[PDB]
C-alpha cells in the first residue's frame, strides 16, 4: 500500500537500540514486553483499550497491576526519543521490541511506522485487559480471543517467555524460562515438555520450577499450554520446528503491534 522514508532516521535509531541492548541485554525482552503490553489493552469487539499509541505513558493504565516494572522500559528510551523527536513512543516502543526481537537471534519482522501517541489517560481503556498468570487455558483463550489472535496466534505470541525473566518486585513470580533468557528461539517450548514441573515452595505466588535443575520457571497460565489440548499440539510443532515457530511469532508480533492502527507506512529499503 502506502511506502515512505519516515519523519526520522530509522537506521540510525536501529544502530541506538541495538546499542542500548549491548550495555545491557535484560533490556530486550523488557521492551518485549512493554510493546506487548502496549498492544494488550485491545478488544476487537468493543474497538477500544487505546493499543499502539503509548497510553501506558497516562494513568490509570500505567498504574495496572500487569504493567507494573514496565516504566525501566518507558524511561529506557526516553534519551532515543530525545534524539529522534519526530518519533511517536508508540512507534519507538514497538520498534525497539523488533530490533530487541532479531539482537536476540528471532526473526527480522516486518515494521511499519505512523502510530500517534495518546496526548491524556481519557482513551485509556479497563484494568482486566492483560492476562492473570496466576490462571488458566480458558482464561488465556478468554483473552487472546477478546485481542482477535486464534489458538495458533495465542501460542506462538506466549513462545516469548524464550526470552526475559520473571522479577520477585514486578509480578511477585521469579526467575527465567530457559537457560538462554537473551536469546529468543523456540526453547521455552522444548524446557515446557522437556522437563517436569513443580510447586517452588519458596514463592508467595505459585510458580512451577524444572525437576532437573530449579533454575526454570513456568507461570500456570505457561504450563495450561501442557493442560490444554489445542495449546499442547501447537506447542509440540514449535518445540519441533524453530522456523514454524520463528514464522508463527513474526506475523502474530507484527499483527499485535498494528491492533487498532490505520494510515501506518512501509519503510522504503
Ligand atoms: C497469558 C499470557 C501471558 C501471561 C500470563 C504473561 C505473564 C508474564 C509475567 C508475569 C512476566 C514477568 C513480569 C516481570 O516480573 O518482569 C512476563 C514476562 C514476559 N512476558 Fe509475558 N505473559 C503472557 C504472554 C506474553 C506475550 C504474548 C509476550 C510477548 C508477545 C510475553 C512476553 C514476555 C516477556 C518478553 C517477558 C519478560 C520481561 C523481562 O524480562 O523484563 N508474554 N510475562
Ligand atoms: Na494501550
Ligand atoms: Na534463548
Request: glycine share 8%.
Amino acid at each position: 500500500k502506502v511506502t515512505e522514508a519516515p519523519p526520522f532516521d530509522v537506521n540510525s535509531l536501529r544502530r541506538d537500540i541495538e546499542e542500548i541492548l549491548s550495555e545491557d541485554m535484560s533490556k530486550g525482552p523488557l521492551f518485549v514486553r512493554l510493546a506487548w503490553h502496549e498492544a494488550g489493552s485491545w478488544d476487537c469487539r468493543k474497538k477500544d483499550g487505546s493499543p499502539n499509541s503509548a497510553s501506558m505513558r497516562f494513568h490509570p493504565e500505567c498504574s495496572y497491576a500487569g504493567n507494573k516494572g514496565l516504566d525501566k522500559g518507558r524511561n529506557a528510551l526516553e534519551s532515543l526519543k530525545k534524539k529522534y523527536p519526530k518519533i511517536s513512543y508508540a512507534d519507538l516502543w514497538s520498534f525497539a521490541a523488533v530490533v530487541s526481537i532479531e539482537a536476540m537471534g528471532g526473526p527480522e519482522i516486518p515494521w511499519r511506522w505512523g502510530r500517534v501517541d495518546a496526548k491524556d489517560g481519557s482513551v485509556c481503556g479497563p484494568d482486566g485487559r492483560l492476562p492473570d498468570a496466576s490462571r488458566m487455558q480458558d482464561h488465556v483463550r478468554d483473552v487472546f480471543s477478546r485481542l482477535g489472535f486464534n489458538d495458533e496466534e495465542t501460542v506462538a505470541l506466549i513462545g516469548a517467555h524464550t526470552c526475559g525473566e520473571c522479577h520477585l518486585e514486578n509480578t511477585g513470580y521469579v526467575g527465567p524460562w530457559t537457560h538462554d533468557k537473551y536469546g529468543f528461539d523456540n526453547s521455552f517450548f522444548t524446557e515446557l515438555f522437556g522437563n517436569e514441573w513443580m510447586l517452588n515452595p519458596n514463592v508467595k505466588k505459585m510458580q512451577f520450577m524444572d525437576k532437573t535443575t530449579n533454575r526454570l520457571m513456568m507461570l500456570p497460565a505457561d504450563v495450561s499450554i501442557l493442560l490444554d489440548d489445542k495449546y499442547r499440539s501447537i506447542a509440540k510443532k514449535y518445540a519441533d520446528d524453530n522456523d514454524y515457530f520463528c514464522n508463527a511469532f513474526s506475523k502474530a508480533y507484527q499483527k499485535l503491534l498494528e491492533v487498532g492502527t490505520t494510515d501506518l507506512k512501509s519503510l522504503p529499503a
